[PDB]
Amino acid sequence: WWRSDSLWQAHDARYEADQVCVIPGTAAVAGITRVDEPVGELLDRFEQAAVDEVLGAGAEPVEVLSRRQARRDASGPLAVVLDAPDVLWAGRMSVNPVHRIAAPTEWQVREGSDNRSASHPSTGARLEVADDQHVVLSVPLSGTW
Amino acid sequence: TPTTVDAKIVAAAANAGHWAELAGGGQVTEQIFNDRIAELETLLEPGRAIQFNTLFLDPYLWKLQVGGKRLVQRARQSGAPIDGLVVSAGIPDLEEAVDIIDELNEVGISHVVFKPGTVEQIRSVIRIAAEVPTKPVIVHIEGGRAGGHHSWEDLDDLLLATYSELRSRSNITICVGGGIGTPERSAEYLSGRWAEVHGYPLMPIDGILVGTAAMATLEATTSPQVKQLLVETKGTEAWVGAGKAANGMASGRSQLGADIHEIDNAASRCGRLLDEVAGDADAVAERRDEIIAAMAQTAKPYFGDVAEMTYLQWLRRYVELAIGDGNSTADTKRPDSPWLDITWRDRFEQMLKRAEARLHPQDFGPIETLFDADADGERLLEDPEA
Numbered sequence A: 001w002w003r004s005d006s007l008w009q010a011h012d013a014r015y016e017a018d019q020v021c022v023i024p025g026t027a028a029v030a031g032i033t034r035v036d037e038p039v040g041e042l043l044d045r046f047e048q049a050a051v052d053e054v055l056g057a058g059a060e061p062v063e064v065l066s067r068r069q070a071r072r073d074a075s076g077p078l079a080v081v082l083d084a085p086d087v088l089w090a091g092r093m094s095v096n097p098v099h100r101i102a103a104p105t106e107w108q109v110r111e112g113s114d115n116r117s118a119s120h121p122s123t124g125a126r127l128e129v130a131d132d133q134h135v136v137l138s139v140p141l142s143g144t145w
Numbered sequence B: 001t002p003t004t005v006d007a008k009i010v011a012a013a014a015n016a017g018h019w020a021e022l023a024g025g026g027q028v029t030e031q032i033f034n035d036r037i038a039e040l041e042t043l044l045e046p047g048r049a050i051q052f053n054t055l056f057l058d059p060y061l062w063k064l065q066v067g068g069k070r071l072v073q074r075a076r077q078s079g080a081p082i083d084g085l086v087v088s089a090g091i092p093d094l095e096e097a098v099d100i101i102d103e104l105n106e107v108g109i110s111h112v113v114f115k116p117g118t119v120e121q122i123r124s125v126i127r128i129a130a131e132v133p134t135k136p137v138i139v140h141i142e143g144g145r146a147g148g149h150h151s152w153e154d155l156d157d158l159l160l161a162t163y164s165e166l167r168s169r170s171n172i173t174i175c176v177g178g179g180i181g182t183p184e185r186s187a188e189y190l191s192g193r194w195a196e197v198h199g200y201p202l203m204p205i206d207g208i209l210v211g212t213a214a215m216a217t218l219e220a221t222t223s224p225q226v227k228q229l230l231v232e233t234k235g236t237e238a239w240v241g242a243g244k245a246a247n248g249m250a251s252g253r254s255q256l257g258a259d260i261h262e263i264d265n266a267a268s269r270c271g272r273l274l275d276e277v278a279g280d281a282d283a284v285a286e287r288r289d290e291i292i293a294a295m296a297q298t299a300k301p302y303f304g305d306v307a308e309m310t311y312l313q314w315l316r317r318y319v320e321l322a323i324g325d326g327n328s329t330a331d332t333k334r335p336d337s338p339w340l341d342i343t344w345r346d347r348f349e350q351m352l353k354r355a356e357a358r359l360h361p362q363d364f365g366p367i368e369t370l371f372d373a374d375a376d377g378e379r380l381l382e383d384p385e386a
């Protein structure tokens, strides 16, 4: 009777909060000081200071950090097609057809590998991928003609 | 459970560009939980994706999960944004884990999440990893220094011993968690420098989870007074065995006997009394005066003397406890808040209808046929005093 459903009073309750079971951890509490600090701030605070510590010693103003403020990338259009397993259509998530296009294809062709802009990946399933209008990646599949 | 159950915070955390797990301990049905995902996907901006957390503890939830997993299956068969599943409090057996991994929603699962608490539990997941070597498995290694569900197992020694075998599987993503509020203290586990204190060569980690430090956050539904309470609590170094409130933190056992880390400074009355009552139950009748008054101190009120108490006092006590004046249950019903107590309002009705059932000498024609009408009865309900 005492311990049942004791976790909900910590949220949206006007009652004295010294009567309530509220759940922290022991050692993590020390790291808890700032109150009503947005989630985005705390999680970034972790990432941003982890970056600085990694940057300063080993990286020392790395090309990766400089490329970011200047907008340069890893995994360009050709890689992105072969990387992300999820293919979005509207608000729905689908599996990457290239996963089933790449290997199962009888004849698979990667056109102009080292050159990014002209890069093309085609298959005997009749599915071909190329880039158009910069960031837009164009996948072209065909049935018969 | 309390924190991430709100669709608002898990969305806001994801909209900040971060991975998060929607709590399942606050959702008792497929339908009620499907509302949350719908509220999530609405607050989810384009493309953004979240995961789900489930508990192994009791059979009813595991039977509910059969409907729950098929709900997750149906959702992702419909193409739902939720990209992961988290099994908690225990590690499913191989045949149980294979099912989860191989579900119709599998691609939408994209990885499976397990939380080993013991050396044996770790070795169990390794066997789940070798089961499907091509399926990503994120192994979150927690402590008992963590919050909520507890354990007697050290943070280091477990990972210290089992790390080598964990790295023989490429599909295993090692994630250390517990007792971490900051990037600075958690940086050494990432570099692998943390194992050097124990003499073991560098032992890097792939990821880090923060449970506790995110509770005082702005978008969290934690009450203003409760947040201030979590704050003023002083923290500690490596957990100590001696029974006490330790840095505003003392362990306590749930109804099933498993330990729970709760705040014993912010609230010192519930936890310590519970330990008193627990260790004291043979002679409870003798300490009854001491025990029954302490329930009233923590606001777990018994009723005034049961016989002598007037039916009003009965019916007025339920209204007192169930109906908040500040939140205005009538005004609480209009937004359609999930905090709605409606079973409590239905509880009070069955008591009211029992009161008419108890005192009426006649055929019960006039009274019962009135209060039972929808339009009539619901209007009578929103006005408890009347």
Ligand SMILES: Cc1cc2nc3c(=O)[nH]c(=O)nc-3n(C[C@H](O)[C@H](O)[C@H](O)COP(=O)(O)O)c2cc1C
Binding pocket: A023, A024, A025, A026, A028, B001, B002, B003, B023, B025, B053, B055, B087, B088, B089, B115, B142, B145, B146, B147, B148, B149, B177, B178, B179, B180, B181, B209, B210, B211, B212, B213
């Ligand atoms: C209020 C609260 C509720 C929690 N609920 C669950 C849960 O339902 N399932 C679970 O596996 N872990 C749960 N946890 C544990 C966290 O998922 C995480 O493992 C732990 O909090 C990390 O340790 P730390 O917060 O002390 O750093 C909960 C923790 C807290 C504080």
